[PDB]
Write an enzyme that holds these catalytic residues in place. Structure first.
Site, short mmCIF file in Angstrom:
data_model
loop_
_atom_site.label_atom_id
_atom_site.label_comp_id
_atom_site.label_asym_id
_atom_site.label_seq_id
_atom_site.Cartn_x
_atom_site.Cartn_y
_atom_site.Cartn_z
N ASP A 15 -55.42 57.71 -27.24
CA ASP A 15 -56.21 58.83 -26.74
C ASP A 15 -55.53 59.66 -25.67
O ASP A 15 -56.18 60.53 -25.11
CB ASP A 15 -57.60 58.36 -26.27
CG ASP A 15 -57.50 57.34 -25.16
OD1 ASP A 15 -58.45 56.58 -24.99
OD2 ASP A 15 -56.42 57.26 -24.50
N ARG A 29 -55.66 64.03 -22.22
CA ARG A 29 -56.48 62.92 -22.54
C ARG A 29 -57.63 63.46 -23.42
O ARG A 29 -58.21 64.47 -23.12
CB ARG A 29 -57.08 62.38 -21.23
CG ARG A 29 -58.16 61.36 -21.38
CD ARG A 29 -57.65 60.09 -22.05
NE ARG A 29 -58.60 58.97 -21.92
CZ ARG A 29 -59.62 58.72 -22.73
NH1 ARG A 29 -59.93 59.57 -23.70
NH2 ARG A 29 -60.36 57.62 -22.54
N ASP A 34 -62.79 56.85 -26.32
CA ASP A 34 -61.95 55.90 -25.71
C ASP A 34 -61.37 55.01 -26.81
O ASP A 34 -62.11 54.43 -27.60
CB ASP A 34 -62.83 55.07 -24.73
CG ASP A 34 -62.01 54.13 -23.83
OD1 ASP A 34 -60.81 54.34 -23.53
OD2 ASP A 34 -62.60 53.08 -23.46
N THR A 35 -60.06 54.98 -26.91
CA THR A 35 -59.36 54.02 -27.76
C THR A 35 -59.05 52.76 -26.96
O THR A 35 -58.88 52.82 -25.72
CB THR A 35 -58.04 54.61 -28.31
OG1 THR A 35 -57.19 55.05 -27.24
CG2 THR A 35 -58.34 55.79 -29.26
N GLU A 37 -57.01 49.67 -25.27
CA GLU A 37 -55.81 49.67 -24.45
C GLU A 37 -54.67 48.89 -25.12
O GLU A 37 -54.91 47.85 -25.74
CB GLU A 37 -56.17 49.06 -23.10
CG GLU A 37 -55.22 49.41 -21.97
CD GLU A 37 -55.16 50.89 -21.69
OE1 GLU A 37 -56.19 51.46 -21.26
OE2 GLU A 37 -54.08 51.48 -21.92
N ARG A 78 -54.78 64.99 -15.76
CA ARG A 78 -54.62 65.07 -17.28
C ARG A 78 -55.48 66.24 -17.81
O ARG A 78 -56.60 66.45 -17.38
CB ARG A 78 -55.06 63.81 -17.92
CG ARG A 78 -54.18 62.63 -17.46
CD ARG A 78 -54.54 61.35 -18.14
NE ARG A 78 -55.95 60.95 -17.90
CZ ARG A 78 -56.52 59.81 -18.26
NH1 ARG A 78 -55.84 58.94 -19.03
NH2 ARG A 78 -57.83 59.59 -17.96
C1 THP Z 1 -62.00 60.99 -20.97
C2 THP Z 1 -62.21 61.20 -19.44
C3 THP Z 1 -61.76 60.24 -18.60
N1 THP Z 1 -61.95 60.41 -17.27
C4 THP Z 1 -61.57 59.37 -16.34
C5 THP Z 1 -62.67 58.31 -16.28
C6 THP Z 1 -61.90 57.03 -16.13
O1 THP Z 1 -61.66 56.90 -14.72
P1 THP Z 1 -61.19 55.54 -14.04
O2 THP Z 1 -59.72 55.45 -14.30
O3 THP Z 1 -61.50 55.76 -12.58
O4 THP Z 1 -61.95 54.46 -14.75
C7 THP Z 1 -60.54 57.28 -16.78
C8 THP Z 1 -60.53 56.74 -18.20
O5 THP Z 1 -59.31 57.16 -18.82
P2 THP Z 1 -58.50 56.11 -19.73
O6 THP Z 1 -59.46 55.73 -20.79
O7 THP Z 1 -57.26 56.88 -20.21
O8 THP Z 1 -58.05 55.01 -18.77
O9 THP Z 1 -60.42 58.71 -16.80
C9 THP Z 1 -62.51 61.60 -16.77
O10 THP Z 1 -62.63 61.73 -15.49
N2 THP Z 1 -62.89 62.60 -17.60
C10 THP Z 1 -62.80 62.44 -18.95
O11 THP Z 1 -63.27 63.33 -19.68
CA CA Z 2 -58.44 54.37 -23.53
#
Ligand code: THP
Ligand code: CA
EC number: 3.1.31.1
Length: 132
Positions: A15, A29, A34-35, A37, A78
């Site tokens: 993702d 992103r 969510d894919t 890890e 991102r």
């Molecule tokens: C998809 C997405 C993730 N995020 C944040 C939430 C999660 O924060 P935390 O890292 O604080 O948990 C993290 C998840 O991304 P990943 O799934 O790439 O790790 O990115 C956003 O803020 N906005 C979004 O639209």
């Molecule tokens: Ca992910």
């Protein structure tokens, strides 16, 4: 919403990927999914989601990014977008296969939420991958 061109620099995982957008490298992103890890500090189907995404974007003629109507970046810098590979949304493609779950639903960036949810419902009804 509208679609804008971008160039694939590097697939990262299911993702997240590096794209050249308006002449500048950025991490993007996917919105609303969510894919699993691959590199948790492997979850199941992590490797499969990563491979599906890598193949879909590496084989594409044309990549496009579509921002939603709110924030265009997250707290990590991102880009937050729906990514399209030859006109097919990758976010939806993953969810349709049961290789992503609909997640991180932050208003106002939820324009395709129902669309994604309907794909997810079908993947679960077909018992695919994550839902197997
Ligand atoms: C998809 C997405 C993730 N995020 C944040 C939430 C999660 O924060 P935390 O890292 O604080 O948990 C993290 C998840 O991304 P990943 O799934 O790439 O790790 O990115 C956003 O803020 N906005 C979004 O639209
Ligand atoms: Ca992910």
């Amino acid at each position: 919403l509208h679609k804008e061109p971008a160039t694939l620099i590097k697939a990262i995982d299911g993702d997240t990927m590096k794209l050249m957008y308006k002449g500048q490298p950025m991490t993007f992103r996917f919105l609303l999914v969510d894919t699993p890890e691959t590199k948790h500090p492997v979850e199941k189907y992590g490797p499969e989601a990563s491979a599906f995404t890598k193949k879909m974007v590496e084989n594409a003629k044309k990549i496009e990014v579509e921002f939603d109507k709110g924030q265009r970046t997250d707290k990590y810098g991102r880009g937050l977008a729906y990514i399209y590979a030859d006109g097919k949304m990758v976010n939806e493609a993953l969810v349709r296969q049961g290789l992503a779950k609909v997640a991180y639903v932050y208003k106002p960036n939820n324009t395709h939420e129902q669309h994604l949810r309907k794909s997810e419902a079908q993947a679960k009804k077909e018992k695919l991958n994550i839902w197997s």
